[PDB]
Design a protein around this motif. Structure first.
Motif, short mmCIF file in Angstrom:
data_model
loop_
_atom_site.label_atom_id
_atom_site.label_comp_id
_atom_site.label_asym_id
_atom_site.label_seq_id
_atom_site.Cartn_x
_atom_site.Cartn_y
_atom_site.Cartn_z
N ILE A 113 -105.63 93.17 5.08
CA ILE A 113 -104.31 93.76 4.89
C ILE A 113 -103.31 92.91 5.66
CG2 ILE A 113 -102.89 95.81 5.11
CD1 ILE A 113 -105.38 97.47 5.06
N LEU A 114 -102.38 92.30 4.95
CA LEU A 114 -101.44 91.37 5.57
C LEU A 114 -100.33 92.14 6.28
CD1 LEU A 114 -101.38 88.84 2.65
CD2 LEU A 114 -102.86 88.89 4.64
N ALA A 115 -99.48 91.40 6.99
CA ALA A 115 -98.50 92.02 7.88
C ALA A 115 -97.42 92.79 7.13
CB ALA A 115 -97.86 90.95 8.76
N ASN A 116 -97.21 92.50 5.85
CA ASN A 116 -96.20 93.19 5.06
C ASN A 116 -96.79 94.26 4.16
OD1 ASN A 116 -97.45 91.47 3.24
ND2 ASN A 116 -95.56 91.00 2.13
N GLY A 117 -98.05 94.63 4.36
CA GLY A 117 -98.70 95.60 3.53
C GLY A 117 -99.40 95.04 2.31
N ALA A 118 -99.38 93.72 2.12
CA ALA A 118 -100.05 93.12 0.99
C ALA A 118 -101.56 93.13 1.19
CB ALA A 118 -99.55 91.69 0.77
N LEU A 119 -102.28 92.81 0.13
CA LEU A 119 -103.73 92.83 0.13
C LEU A 119 -104.29 91.46 -0.21
CD1 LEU A 119 -105.05 96.09 -1.51
CD2 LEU A 119 -104.45 95.61 0.86
N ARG A 120 -105.40 91.11 0.43
CA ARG A 120 -106.25 90.01 0.01
C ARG A 120 -107.55 90.66 -0.45
NH1 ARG A 120 -107.24 84.87 2.85
NH2 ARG A 120 -106.20 85.90 4.61
N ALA A 121 -107.60 91.04 -1.72
CA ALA A 121 -108.72 91.80 -2.24
C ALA A 121 -109.61 90.90 -3.09
CB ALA A 121 -108.22 93.00 -3.04
N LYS A 166 -109.27 95.63 9.63
CA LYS A 166 -108.96 94.73 8.54
C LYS A 166 -107.50 94.32 8.50
CE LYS A 166 -112.60 95.80 5.23
NZ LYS A 166 -112.97 96.69 4.10
N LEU A 167 -106.69 94.83 9.42
CA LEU A 167 -105.27 94.51 9.46
C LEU A 167 -105.07 93.18 10.17
CD1 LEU A 167 -104.94 97.60 8.72
CD2 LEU A 167 -102.86 97.49 10.08
N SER A 168 -104.46 92.22 9.48
CA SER A 168 -104.23 90.90 10.04
C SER A 168 -102.74 90.64 10.17
CB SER A 168 -104.87 89.82 9.16
OG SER A 168 -104.29 88.56 9.40
N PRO A 203 -97.39 101.68 2.60
CA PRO A 203 -97.35 100.23 2.88
C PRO A 203 -96.12 99.80 3.65
CG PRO A 203 -98.01 100.64 0.62
CD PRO A 203 -97.55 101.95 1.17
N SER A 204 -95.06 100.60 3.65
CA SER A 204 -93.85 100.26 4.38
C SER A 204 -93.97 100.50 5.88
CB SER A 204 -92.67 101.06 3.83
OG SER A 204 -92.97 102.45 3.80
N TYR A 205 -95.00 101.20 6.33
CA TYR A 205 -95.21 101.45 7.75
C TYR A 205 -96.17 100.47 8.40
CZ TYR A 205 -95.22 104.38 11.93
OH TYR A 205 -95.07 104.87 13.21
N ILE A 206 -96.78 99.58 7.62
CA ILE A 206 -97.83 98.71 8.14
C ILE A 206 -97.30 97.85 9.29
CG2 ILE A 206 -99.31 96.76 7.56
CD1 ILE A 206 -100.45 99.31 6.62
N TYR A 207 -96.04 97.43 9.20
CA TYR A 207 -95.44 96.64 10.27
C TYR A 207 -95.64 97.31 11.63
CZ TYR A 207 -91.59 99.89 10.76
OH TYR A 207 -90.84 101.02 10.99
N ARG A 208 -95.43 98.63 11.69
CA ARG A 208 -95.60 99.32 12.96
C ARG A 208 -97.04 99.23 13.44
NH1 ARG A 208 -92.95 101.00 17.58
NH2 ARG A 208 -94.60 102.10 18.71
N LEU A 209 -97.99 99.43 12.53
CA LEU A 209 -99.39 99.27 12.90
C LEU A 209 -99.70 97.86 13.35
CD1 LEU A 209 -101.06 101.39 10.07
CD2 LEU A 209 -99.92 102.10 12.17
#
Lengths: 301, 175, 301
Positions: free
Chosen positions: B63-71, B97-99, B157-163
């Motif tokens: 899971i990329l820093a902007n909420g995108a996926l490498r699936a 899995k958050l990168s 996905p818009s909150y991933i930045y905080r994580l």
């Protein structure tokens, strides 16, 4: 007649009637060329008319001129398909060409009569560039005792939007000129969009003055209706897939025809897909874009 | 996730095989051993069957820093098909899995395995003029993702930045 | 400091460093006003600073100036909340303001360092109007040995696009100037869009030079990425709902402040919704639009 006389006749036809469309003037000049022709074979007449058409297209690069030339070529082909004798064929060609000119001289009135009923009272109309057909439609709407406001884009670089604004002020209509960049800012005010067309392509989309495609996209974003007014002689058998699929001879003007103030020779026309068009108001009536292709499929084949 | 849900609920699962490594087949066998009504189909039928699919639940590799996926490959197509029908897309991925790496470039996103999986070596001379590529991973933009389910709950996905910010330090993004 | 001296100081600060942003110059002028203040109470200082901010906003109508003034007001409020004694409060305010100026003098370098890695080699970048931050980002991309082409809109009526094109030509980058109306025609060529921002509203959208909204809409139509570069001091606590919800003091210039050649006093800024924005490259890092609101929710309350 010779090429120089052909060009002089076309330019004089345009000059005598400023309101005359370029395609109509080209068709009338082609009819005059047919009348003045001396050949006695259909193939020679077709070759001479093709030379005349390419000369006129060199003079005027608008899609309307090319579509009118192709329409005249198809007209003479249809006339030749009926009667094999060339003399009777030419007589019938002259008579039907005169009738064709008379009929297409009244397209704008029919378009205005059909379209003026779509303008709701107390509405705002957004328009791009100058268009005589749109002017006639708004004249008809005003004559029907309807009050409406108009926003007109500047339409750089020739600033035809200001000319359209002057024309609308002549009709005592509240008209406001906006920048092209401001189109997306003003779409929320416009109840509907009415634009002309320099040519209607096979799929039902249009080829119009640069800036129409982004107006159509912005209208689609805000779910505003997008109306096109164009005569039948502007129908052309072209199928562009994107903006670069439009022929280069139409994008760049006749007189006009790297990485440092290049400006990429700013195009004058762009292509608007039929999915961004709600209805067309032609002299054949009110049509969906999908109807346009029909008029061509029946025309050929 | 599905096996836990199936204890109290009845539902129908459709698994795409995810060619060339047809791991989905195994995913369909295990779900079949749990009594879940499951269906296998190739990746070519994703759009055709999506019209009758209510929810999409997928895993991910990163899971990329902007909420995108490498699936896995073919997941971008599945996400597009779900977005066409406005089907919710749920990503069940844990916290590790958050990168913090953004998908700017780096030319190190996809993992290209040997083209033996796509075109067999027994094809012959045809292989001397044909360029065969076998990417393993697909980039899924965050616009096509509806919800992230992690060990800490559900997030948009818009909150991933905080994580990102409470897990990794910005000075440690580039090792 | 009186109003005339405040205006003179702000204008001189802008003139000495042309590359200095308007918001940064306004914040520095506000800090100078704080240093020169004679009052011995928090409320009097707050009122004087509010009057100074109003004067500066009257001088410059950009959203950046207003956001910088609001940021300075929140800064002095945060300093006053912790410390009850006004003398220590003013000393700490002066020291932290100097540190604040030093830190925000380096925002552009951080933005360029973060953003230049998003420009793929051999790509086309579409830009609207002039922006020093975008210029720095492209400088960083060039210094990283990347070759790319640039399309720049004219950005009527001040034609800042030509100025941006000249600036890019100084860096030996292939740059082509297009008309605003041609944006929808050229989007199919651009790999990505990079624009600046005169202000980032609460929801994550931006308020930028007129024509940015239609560029964003066209990019969304063709699924092209839309990137915004803006410093943290441009964050504003505004929530427009549409184009008319933007305050009028921002649309129309300072010196600027029917139905017949009216032109309705062409706006200078428009609002782009966060749904049309892919990422933001601030001095706080690379953010989604939803992060912007966070930076404000934590700033107040």
């Amino acid at each position: 007649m010779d090429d120089k006389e052909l060009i002089e006749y076309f330019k004089s036809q345009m000059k005598e009637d400023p309101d005359m469309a370029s395609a109509v003037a080209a068709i009338r000049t082609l009819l005059e060329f047919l009348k003045r022709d001396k050949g006695e074979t259909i193939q020679g007449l077709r070759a001479n008319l093709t030379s005349a058409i390419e000369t006129l297209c060199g003079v005027d690069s608008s899609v309307a001129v090319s579509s009118g030339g192709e329409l005249f070529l198809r007209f003479i082909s249809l006339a030749s398909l009926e009667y094999s004798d060339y003399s009777k064929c030419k007589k019938i060609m002259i008579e039907r060409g005169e009738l064709f000119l008379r009929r297409i001289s009244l397209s704008r009135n029919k378009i205005a009569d059909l379209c003026h009923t779509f303008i709701k009272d107390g509405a705002t109309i957004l328009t791009h560039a100058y268009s005589r057909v749109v002017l006639r439609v708004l004249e008809a709407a005003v004559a029907a005792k309807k009050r409406f406001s108009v926003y007109v884009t500047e339409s750089q670089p020739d600033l035809s939007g200001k000319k359209m604004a002057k024309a609308l002020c002549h009709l005592n209509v509240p008209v406001t000129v906006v920048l092209d960049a401001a189109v997306g800012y003003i779409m929320e005010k416009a109840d509907l969009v009415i634009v002309g067309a320099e040519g209607v392509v096979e799929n039902g989309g249009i080829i119009n003055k640069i800036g129409t495609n982004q107006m159509a996209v912005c209208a689609k974003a805000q779910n505003k209706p997008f109306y096109v007014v164009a005569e039948s002689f502007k129908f052309v058998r072209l199928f562009p897939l994107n903006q670069q699929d439009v022929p280069d001879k139409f994008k760049y003007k006749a007189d006009t025809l790297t990485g440092q103030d290049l400006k990429e020779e700013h195009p004058w026309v762009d292509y608007t897909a039929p999915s961004l068009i709600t209805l067309l108001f032609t002299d054949l009536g009110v049509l969906t874009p999908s109807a346009v292709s029909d008029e061509l499929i029946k025309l050929y084949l | 996730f599905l096996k836990e849900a199936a204890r109290k609920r009845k539902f129908h699962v459709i698994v795409a095989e995810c060619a060339p490594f047809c791991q989905g087949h195994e995913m369909a066998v295990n779900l079949s051993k749990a009594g879940i009504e499951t269906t296998v189909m190739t990746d070519a039928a994703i759009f055709a069957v999506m019209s009758r699919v209510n929810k999409v639940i997928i895993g991910t590799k990163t899971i990329l820093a902007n909420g995108a996926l490498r699936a896995v490959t073919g997941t971008h197509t599945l996400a597009l098909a779900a977005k066409h029908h406005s089907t919710p897309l749920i990503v069940c991925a844990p916290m590790f899995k958050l990168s913090p790496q953004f998908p700017n470039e780096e030319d190190s996103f996809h993992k290209f395995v040997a083209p033996e999986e796509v075109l067999p070596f027994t094809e012959g001379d045809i292989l001397e003029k044909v360029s065969v590529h076998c990417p393993v991973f697909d980039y899924v933009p965050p616009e096509l993702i509806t919800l992230f389910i992690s060990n800490i709950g559900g997030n948009a996905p818009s909150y991933i930045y905080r994580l990102m910010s409470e897990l990794y330090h910005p000075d440690d993004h580039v090792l």
